[PDB]
Amino acid sequence: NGIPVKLLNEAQGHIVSLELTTGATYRGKLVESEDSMNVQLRDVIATEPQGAVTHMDQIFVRGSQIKFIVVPDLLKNAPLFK
Amino acid sequence: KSRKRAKKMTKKAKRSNLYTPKAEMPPEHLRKIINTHSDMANTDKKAFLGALKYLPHAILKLLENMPHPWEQAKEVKVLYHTSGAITFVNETPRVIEPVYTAQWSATWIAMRREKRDRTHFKRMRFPPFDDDEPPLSYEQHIENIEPLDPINLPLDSQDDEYVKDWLYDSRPLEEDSKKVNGTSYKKWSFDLPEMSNLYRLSTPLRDEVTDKNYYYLFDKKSFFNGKALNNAIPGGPKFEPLYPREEEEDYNEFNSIDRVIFRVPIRSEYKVAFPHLYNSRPRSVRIPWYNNPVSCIIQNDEEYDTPALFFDPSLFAPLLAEEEELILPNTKDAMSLYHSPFPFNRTKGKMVRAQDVALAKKWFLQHPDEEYPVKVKVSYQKLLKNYVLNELHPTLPTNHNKTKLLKSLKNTKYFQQTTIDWVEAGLQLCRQGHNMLNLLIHRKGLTYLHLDYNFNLKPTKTLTTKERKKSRLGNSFHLMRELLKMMKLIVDTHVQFRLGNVDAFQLADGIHYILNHIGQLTGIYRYKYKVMHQIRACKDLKHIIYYKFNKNLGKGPGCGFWQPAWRVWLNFLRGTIPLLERYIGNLITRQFE
């Protein structure tokens, strides 16, 4: 199975950042993730590609349309890789 | 390379220069020496005098290398003085412990069979030879008829296939292989089937019921608790009270008759099981265990791995799929082995003295008291007490240099390591012992009294008060004499066995008689009465054996299994040797300080 998927799963709880194909960055507590990166997030801000930002509650995103996910730097340490 | 060489040199010449290891000489030479000594009949050299100091140790060593019923002749290594004196055994005896147990079990079985068979079992008469005369023997023994069939039961090829080729042998065997370290014989390893076989063989002897719960209130901790509460268990032992029995309750506001309700009887049994609750003021009382219950099945049938006596319930290949059929041919008994007590649950171990390997212990810890006679029960209790006290006060040693090895090394005048028949060695010791006694006597006031060759000292004639005063001598000397006599008796039985007009079964039986009757056959108790404790212990052991032995219709004089008694004797000897040695030293250093 995919180690990036595993990492994503681990990041559950933590405040992940998240850009899509559209280029609309989010940042929030990662509620749930699946094998396909079907992310849910809480307390989430939402930047438009142009500039403006909008607060929102419980966003769902489908991994297909996700581009890249930033996880907190604590997860670097352990305990997924070995 | 040069540097390395230099280093090596430094390592070498700084401390401990090469003392040459002396060769193993012929027994013929030893015999010749002995003969010469005999011819000589006193010399009173200094070296000779010095060597005499270590006779009780020698005796002890000899005793330790007793040939077991399964062994024809214990061929044994020996140190011996240039004169032909103090000719004592070198090697320590030792054994693969489960193997040893198996052997013992086999012997027991054989004995039982013999009992079943023979009607008029002729017991051995003691003392075996004419004490008035000096019937010793060497040459005769050497060129005697074939040492007749010793005690080993006949094994079938089906069941005990893996052992029968090696089981009954000197060392014992499995001595030259991958299954041991080597001839030094310190670490033993095993495969399964052989181990299983050994276990099976044992069962007759060591059926210790190892449901840890069986020993509820018969664990050493429990016994300790009992001791330090002045409390008992019908089957368990009893002691002096360990603290002063000073009650004086004075029926207070608390603990009155009309305050408390005497509903439970509050027996002794409870007080140790819950030391801190039922007993008030538990000084130095260890916390006992509290374990879970056992579900098990142990059987002797053809079929395996089935519900026998349980209650019945209500209603790509998987990864091993005909690699196997779920039961291999050994796994029937593998499981049993796994379940077992110490020796066998392990397939490797360290070897132990055979004066270790207590085969009694497990019987006299096993809470028997139902349908036995009272004497037996008493004996068991005594045994427990003996054990328990020992457990309570252990002992710690440290760095030391052993005497035999020292003599081998530094001493001239010694020749060393002549492989003698053990019986021959014993005989020599007996002779030498006798000589030593005579020498001692000579050194003291030269007496009217003379030794029997079987050591029973007695006056020749001319009995007076002055004479008595002169020739009271020490208790130590008499103890020594007694010890010598004992050795002779055991040695003499072996001698008898070696010659005709005897049996191997009789040999073991004779040995048993000797050991389990010191009190009858020779009084040490007269001179050292702590030997009486030992004697008592031996008696108890004998008692335990006899009931255990004679469950079947057999009841009479024939029964070997001398092991525990022998062990006890060895222990006693060990306890006593040092004092004896000291005494001897004192005697020799009479003129000087």
Partner: protein
């Protein structure tokens, strides 16, 4: 301030996972299962906890040679003289550990090892109060006793998620010497009993709730775990859940790659018996009985785990234990099962209400925490406290109530 902390850290066993990570995780809820390991007297829950501890740590201080070999347990949470001398775990002397799952989602778990013995329900009760999940543990053999039923009843009341641990399979393989079929039947019966004891939830090896264990030897598995280790090799990924489902219950599997028809033809032994229990039995036999080389070969082939040179020269019980540890790995399966069990947090609110009346919480403006039990962990007194809401920092000036 820091020096003291450093010193404290030093006087401690170095954990295999980094404790920093655990700490970080703890800063987030929902990554913290609080687990009460509970059961009857001598279930082997303490032993199980010991296994977990072993898995966690690199090398333990008072882990003797004998214990390492696998003779005596090393009940790592027995602690105080009383308990080691006595045999019984007596007080709630728990442990906290990070644990990866099947699919390695780490999660910092706050295990509390109950006492079994019935006169210490106090500690058990405390554990229940603390712990949002409870690993009930049961002796296979002793079965679901009345005690266990009572526990179950008084874990539904609390309330809590109930993973079960059918511990002591060795006892039915080696002590009872049940045939494999018989063993399976017994297990089924036990499961049924458990279900009966329960009101609402059904428990089974499928749906990750049963955890089959033998702590003496020291293996736990769930069925999913087993599949992961030893049946990904031989099946395509899509049909793994299905396979798992098939595994338990009145189901049979005939020579057909890959069906698996419920029932049936000629030689019986069900899916569970064929793909699990039977395998276990074989392992046991081989471990004890077989020529060692052949066993090794088998383990290279059928499990891809290598009996080392030093391990080969072991005695049986130890050797067997070693084998089983090699097979079923450092117990992730159990953790996974636990995770599956705990809803999570639908229950938690209810539990909190039960503890302290129904109502509504306040996260930021305050913190509150149940001081559960005073203890004597490091000689001196501590209060084992559970923080329900807020975050309680060191030195903080704090309100309290004896209840």
């Amino acid at each position: 301030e820091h020096t003291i902390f450093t010193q404290l850290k030093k006087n401690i066993p170095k954990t295999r996972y980094n404790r920093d990570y655990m700490l970080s995780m703890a800063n987030i809820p929902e990554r913290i299962i609080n687990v009460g390991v509970i059961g009857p007297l001598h279930s082997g829950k303490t032993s199980l906890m010991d296994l977990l501890v072993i898995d966690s740590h690199k090398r333990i201080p008072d882990m003797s040679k004998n214990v390492e070999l696998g003779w005596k347990p090393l009940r790592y949470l027995d602690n105080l003289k009383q308990e080691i001398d006595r045999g019984l775990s007596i007080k709630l002397n728990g442990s906290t550990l990070l644990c990866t799952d099947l699919e390695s989602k780490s999660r910092m778990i706050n295990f509390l090892d109950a006492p079994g013995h019935v006169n210490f329900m106090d500690e058990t009760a405390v554990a229940l109060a603390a712990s949002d999940l409870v690993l009930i543990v049961i002796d296979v053999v002793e079965g679901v006793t009345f005690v266990v039923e009572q526990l179950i009843k008084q874990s539904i009341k609390n309330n809590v998620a109930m993973c079960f641990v059918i511990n002591k399979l060795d006892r039915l393989i080696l002590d009872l010497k049940l045939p494999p079929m018989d063993a399976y039947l017994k297990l089924n019966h036990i499961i049924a009993n458990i279900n009966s004891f329960t009101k609402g939830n059904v428990f089974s090896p499928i749906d990750n709730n049963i955890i089959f264990a033998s702590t003496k030897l020291g293996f736990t598995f769930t069925i999913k775990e087993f599949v992961s280790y030893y049946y990904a090799h031989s099946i395509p990924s899509s049909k793994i859940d299905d396979f798992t489902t098939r595994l338990w219950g009145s189901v049979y599997y005939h020579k057909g790659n890959f069906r698996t028809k419920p029932f049936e033809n000629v030689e019986k032994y069900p899916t569970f018996v064929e793909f699990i229990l039977i395998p276990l039995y074989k392992i046991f036999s081989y471990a004890l009985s077989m020529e060692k080389d052949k066993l090794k070969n088998l383990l290279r082939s059928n499990f891809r785990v290598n009996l080392s040179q030093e391990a080969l020269q072991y005695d049986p019980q130890p050797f067997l234990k070693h084998v089983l540890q090699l097979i079923f790995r450092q117990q992730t399966g159990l953790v996974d099962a636990i995770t599956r069990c705990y809803q999570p947090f639908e229950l938690f609110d209810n539990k909190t209400a039960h503890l302290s009346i129904p109502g509504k919480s306040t996260p930021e403006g305050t913190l509150w925490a149940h001081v559960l039990k005073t203890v004597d962990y490091g000689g001196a007194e501590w209060s084992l406290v559970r923080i329900y809401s807020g975050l309680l920092k060191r030195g903080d000036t704090v309100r309290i109530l004896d209840t």
